[PDB]
């Protein structure tokens, strides 16, 4: 076979616009496979100096987390002040979730339907998911809105926040997502509801993964079942959303395993009444942005791919880790060795697939030409 | 005696306050995972503990 | 292969009634053989009840196969005596509307058992909405209909059996004993709960809403660390201890920090005998369970299903394909690790959602098994697989695949969500199979050849 690089726009050098910043050296190339003989090429990755950020804070407002909501009224400005050191562009948003509004999960008596908690506490009626504030670059509005939020109450310890994650990920323009680093913070202190638990409430339709927000409120919470982790992983990967789990110490292992399952996400240890959320977020972002994961899209049948990693400090990994290069710092070049194998001659004369680092819109186009 | 549960969707903070009030009340507290049971509680003690648990939103019992 | 997929019989119920959510055989191998179909959301002619649920009787043999509803109960929600005595007038104790009655239909001989998992009833002491389980037990061809609501007891709240939701899964042992599973008992810890028909009938006394059955067997409450385990999500019966009494098999999908496990409870007691932990977290290990002899050794073998298990294709992209685990029994005892695993081949197919023994469908001396994929197929309509038995257990390749004949629609068909088999309708010695398609309110019957 052979190969030829078409565009190969030079990656941005050491110190503009999120779309004008390049982080993959080769862009488009053609591989002329020769059946058994495979073809290989190399692509350079270089972390950008400063890249915009979009953070969406999704918090649990059950009766538990009552104290946490009292120590978040200053997060809007504090996080922005502590984040300017990292990027010159930043936007923040807020959102809350409690539970599906059906019988087995929430008491249906009117007295408990208006005030789910005890008479001493003045709670609000339960809701599935509310988009308090779309992404914005002003922290004063964040503080003002989050200050007046009211806690809610429920019945069962686990909370139905997975559907909230789905609505956040798929709604797009309503949430104001941009084509920059998308961060999602998921704050809770209890387990989670996934597909199959809606059968106890008479809900059997699987989640369809669509934006069902009317007046910043998630309707249809009674119609569709909770989303399975596979669906959440698929949608998060498709939307390039990186998740941070800020959960208490009691439920640490569950979310550790969850983050093991989900790609490009981190788990923190929220403490006290959300005292150290800012440092947790910064640490999680630093940990996430210092790794690169390469993935391909729907490789054609009869074609198999292989990844090789040329990391920093002389460590050269292979195997399934060939697509993973950890410990990359700011402006630290990294190279990958990619080889494509084609063990047949598919009728498709030329089928192309894209290799894309997780969490970035930058793509390298690979065009195959069998024979 | 009194055995509050607080095992539903109840804040963790409002579960060691009951333990603190019981211990500072001179009684004996048998701590457990999201469950507290006391011993040597008198009628006035049991009534006060039940009232406090009800105000806190816990699920008070008696043994 | 064997099942006459060329032209099966189709039974259709009222639109939007979830007809076919549960299926069962009635009086097989005898005159009056019929098929029972549940319609959890079917409008009934009860006083002041909306979508109270129903169970249909479909006689077999008649060319039209007309289905008619059984009148298990025609009394609207009861009223609190104090309400009409005091200045209240009307204040129903029970909430029978939208009770999802008929979501579980099981029969054994002349007895039938229809349960309403979402039955809720205001407590007579203080206002509440506890959704306990209530079941009806027809006896002697509808001669005497009893009511079994064991979780409707003194302990009335989520902290007790108030949210038991009993009848979520039911079963009949070979001796007629009734087995129930309440997923929502003791803060969703779960609870297995059984009693023989003689005990139920002897203690029946409908005046008191809170009725206690003598000699009843039930699992005790456990520490708080076991909350939200959902024990009893699905139940099955088989001989696993060497005794003469069938032993209980129960699913705990969300136990062990959401990994899930299955437990086998001894007969004549309720003690636990074996545990079978799950493989992957959130793989909903315990959606369905079954116990049948799949290697002709004379000893029952356990089967489990994890519809949500996530597997990654060789390319690398993860995909949601269900899984089924098979444990073979030996004279010494069952092993803790699976002897074989079956995996789906379609994304979001929920493979292993439902399982059911088919008996010696091929008459080759080895029992067969049917596994359903509600959202499988090439158009997400649902598929059912048949896996032959053999000396080494289940075969890794399905012998037959069943799909709906009607064209796809905008709503999911849920074909294969509910399955039943192991009994002969036409009486020709070849077992049969009933498949639920409640997405379109239809049930199909398949017969050997
Ligand atoms: C299969 O897998 C399941 C799920 O993991 C296992 O189920 C668990 O098994 C444990 C085995 O010990 C059980 O622990 C025991 O639970 C009983 C019943 O709760 C305790 O005895 C009673 O506990 C209640 C709890 O409030 C008390 O109120 C009673 O006073 C206790 N006594 C009586 C007579 O009822 C047991 O107490 C022992 O352990 C404690 C631990 O600190 C110790 O302090 C005691 O001195 C005593 O030695 C014990 O805790 C789990 O309860 C049980 N969980 C569930 C949900 O069923 C199952 O065993 C596995 N089986 C197999 C074969 O693998
Ligand atoms: C978390 O919240 C608690 C309670 O608000 C704080 O402790 C004090 O508790 C008293 C009542 O018991 C309140 O009146 C005070 O306002 C609380 N202090 C503050 C600063 O709000 C506790 O300090 C907070 N932080 C923790 C526990 O780390
Ligand atoms: C059972 O009947 C009720 C009412 O007859 C149906 O609920 C709706 O009721 C309104 C009037 O209150 C009608 O205008 C609607 O047409 C009814 N819905 C439908 C779908 O017809 C309820 O839907 C019926 N249930 C079933 C399963 O058909
Ligand atoms: C299942 O429970 C039965 C009921 O107790 C067990 O049978 C008992 O076995 C002990 C063992 O010596 C005898 O002392 C009892 O008299 C038996 N009782 C009955 C009613 O049979 C049986 O052993 C248990 N199964 C297993 C595997 O242990
Ligand atoms: C069993 O019952 C079938 C249906 O009739 C049922 O029983 C009668 C007494 C009424 O209660 C009716 O509402 C029920 O649906 C009969 O068709 C069948 O013949 C009966 N079996 C025998 C052996 O008689
Ligand atoms: C709870 O607080 C809100 C906020 O003003 C108030 O409108 C409401 O009346 C309070 N609840 C009750 C029961 O008064
Ligand atoms: C972001 O990139 C996608 C990639 O196709 C493109 O469709 C979209 O217009 C870009 N802009 C925004 C705001 O999403
Ligand atoms: C890793 O690759 C670099 C670049 O090709 C090379 O200089 C170095 O010797 C290699 N080391 C190992 C351990 O593979
Ligand atoms: C990352 O690299 C630095 C130096 O380049 C080294 O000190 C550190 O131990 C590395 N961390 C890991 C996890 O390899
Ligand atoms: C819970 O699951 C883990 C992982 O599958 C397993 O190692 C552990 O043994 C399970 N729990 C028990 C009590 O076996
Ligand atoms: Ca066997
Ligand atoms: Ca066979
Ligand atoms: Ca037949
Ligand atoms: Mn909570």
Residue numbers in the entry:
A (entry chain B): 65 to 79, 86 to 441
B (entry chain C): 2 to 64
C (entry chain A): 1 to 449
How do the authors describe this structure?
Integrin α5β1 is one of the principal receptors for fibronectin (FN), a major component of extracellular matrix (ECM) component that is extensively expressed in various cells and tissues. The interactions between α5β1 and FN are vital for cell attachment and migration, making them integral to various stages of development and tissue regeneration, notably in wound healing, bone regeneration, and stem cell therapy. We use computational protein design to create de novo α5β1‐specific modulating miniprotein binders, called NeoNectins, that bind to and stabilize the open state of α5β1.
We set out to design α5β1 protein binders that can bind the interface between α5 and β1 subunits, including the RGD‐binding pocket and adjacent regions, to stabilize the active conformation of α5β1. While the RGD binding site is highly conserved between RGD binding integrins, a nearby unique hydrophobic pocket formed by Trp157α5, Phe155α5, and L157β1 offers opportunities for targeting α5β1 specifically. In contrast, the corresponding residues of the close structural homolog, αvβ3 are hydrophilic (S146αv, D148αv, and R216β3).
